[PDB]
Design a protein around this ligand. Sequence first.
Ligand SMILES: *C(=O)[C@@H]([C@@H]1N=C(C(=O)O)[C@@H](S[C@@H]2CN[C@H](C(=O)N(C)C)C2)[C@@H]1C)[C@@H](C)O
Length: 260
Amino acid sequence: SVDKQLAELERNANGRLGVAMINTGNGTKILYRAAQRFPFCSTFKFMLAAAVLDQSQSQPNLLNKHINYHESDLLSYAPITRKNLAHGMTVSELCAATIQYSDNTAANLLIKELGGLAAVNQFARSIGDQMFRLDRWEPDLNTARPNDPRDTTTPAAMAASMNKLVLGDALRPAQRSQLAVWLKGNTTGDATIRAGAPTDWIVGDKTGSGDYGTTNDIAVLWPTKGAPIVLVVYFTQREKDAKPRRDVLASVTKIILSQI
Ligand SMILES: *C(=O)[C@@H]([C@@H]1N=C(C(=O)O)[C@@H](S[C@@H]2CN[C@H](C(=O)N(C)C)C2)[C@@H]1C)[C@@H](C)O
């Protein structure tokens, strides 16, 4: 029983947890509050990177476009764009730094490139994600305030989106392969989904955190045995200044993967 382990974990943690798992092997799913909205935090950047890859399908030079951004574009959390300030970065490098370091300048630059917040939402709509809603730019989208639907999705919608994009036919093969490569090279995810997964598996993920101790992580897991698995874990807590609970996500992963 996942449900009772999950509820116990959630009650002990004093948060709300949302979980969707899809096993693309047999098509089983494990759902917990899967249809409830949660602040997506940096997990949006997954959907952002996918949208950029979608436009690159029309525009063969898009990923190679060199972006000479300036000092003014730099945000508080931007280690990789800060690193490359002098020389600029390609759109492709911007997507990698957004996914793998969650760089906020790289994200905001890619939204500009797509032509605004609404372009990401319209992309989400094009793939059948009806729950995804991006309302603000980085980093204002991480306030994660109680009962604020801004900058939110559902675990189920996000899992279905990751499924279609990484493991499905929503993108052309070069694009979707690039999307999985970016994810596999994520550097921020060691303590969350990765830490609860068998040490011989490969995990591609995008993390997220914000106020109210919001702690999120979305992943494709490549097992040693069968087909890939999509896991989306969202978690949020009572108080604004809650510390993130990366251990809760690793625990969920332990709980979920045991079942399969
Ligand atoms: C989005 O989630 C944020 C950027 N992506 C992050 C991530 O995936 O780790 C963050 S948070 C990082 C870990 N916790 C610290 C923190 O600032 N929070 C607890 C809020 C640093 C990275 C800044 C960003 C847009 O909020």
